[PDB]
Amino acid sequence: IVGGYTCGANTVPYQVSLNSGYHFCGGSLINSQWVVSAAHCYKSGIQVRLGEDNINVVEGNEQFISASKSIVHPSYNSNTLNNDIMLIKLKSAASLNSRVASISLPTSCASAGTQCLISGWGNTKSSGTSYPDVLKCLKAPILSDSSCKSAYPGQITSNMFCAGYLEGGKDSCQGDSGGPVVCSGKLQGIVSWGSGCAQKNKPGVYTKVCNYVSWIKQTIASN
Numbered sequence: 001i002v003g004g005y006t007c008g009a010n011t012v013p014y015q016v017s018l019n020s021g022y023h024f025c026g027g028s029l030i031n032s033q034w035v036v037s038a039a040h041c042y043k044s045g046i047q048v049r050l051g052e053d054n055i056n057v058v059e060g061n062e063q064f065i066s067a068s069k070s071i072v073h074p075s076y077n078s079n080t081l082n083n084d085i086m087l088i089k090l091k092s093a094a095s096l097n098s099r100v101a102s103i104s105l106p107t108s109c110a111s112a113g114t115q116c117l118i119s120g121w122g123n124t125k126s127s128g129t130s131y132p133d134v135l136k137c138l139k140a141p142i143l144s145d146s147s148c149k150s151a152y153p154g155q156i157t158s159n160m161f162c163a164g165y166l167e168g169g170k171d172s173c174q175g176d177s178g179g180p181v182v183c184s185g186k187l188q189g190i191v192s193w194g195s196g197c198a199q200k201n202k203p204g205v206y207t208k209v210c211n212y213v214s215w216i217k218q219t220i221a222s223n
């Protein structure tokens with residue numbers, strides 16, 4: 001997260017860190033046994049870490065659980081990043097309390113103009129590199145599909161939306177990938193891609209979760 005603020009420990013309870021020896025992507029807890037992330041975050045050997053603030057210190061509220069299975073969307077295209085969404089089932093259910101909570105799936109798509117909360121442990125600079133130890137947050141609006149398509153000609157599909165500031169300076173970044181975009185208490189997006197981070201006229205591109213609700217529910221109902 002470039003240009004954001006320190007969230008505060010456990011103030012984003014559905015935020016997860018995907019660890020394979022080190023933090024490599026974010027994700028969101030959608031029920032006690034399932035996590036949603038970006039398909040471009042896929043790897044074998046994922047350990048899911050819940051209840052994290054400082055990912056380098058054990059502070060007392062963590063639950064580290066291994067994944068028993070991961071399911072990349074059937075239509076994921078790694079060249080275009082269309083359908084950049086994956087499901088990860090945990091080996092055992094997480095214990096839910098006020099600091100580890102699921103985030104509700106959307107019942108409708110959110111509109112341009114809606115303000116959302118984006119969070120993650122990714123890079124905090126647009127030029128160099130500086131990864132934070134504690135969770136960063138950014139409030140940003142969903143942009144209109146026209147400006148989104150204007151910023152990225154021939155690249156935005158109906159499964160994507162832009163959120164951010166055209167002026168630059170505030171955006172998600174590398175390391176935030178797979179993380180949540182929550183608007184009015186519902187998971188609306190997944191940190192997916194963008195050109196560089198926080199550049200002028202290159203807002204962040206997010207997977208449009210409302211389009212995948214049926215696929216998520218039935219996949220979890222059969223696995």
Ligand SMILES: CP(=O)(O)c1ccc(C(=N)N)cc1
Pocket residue numbers: 040171172173174175176177178191192193194195196197198203204205
């Ligand atoms: C494909 P990725 O995971 O490296 C990524 C994700 C988000 C951005 C951004 N918001 N500018 C840039 C790159």
Ligand SMILES: [Ca+2]
Pocket residue numbers: 052053054055056057058059062
């Ligand atoms: Ca920790």
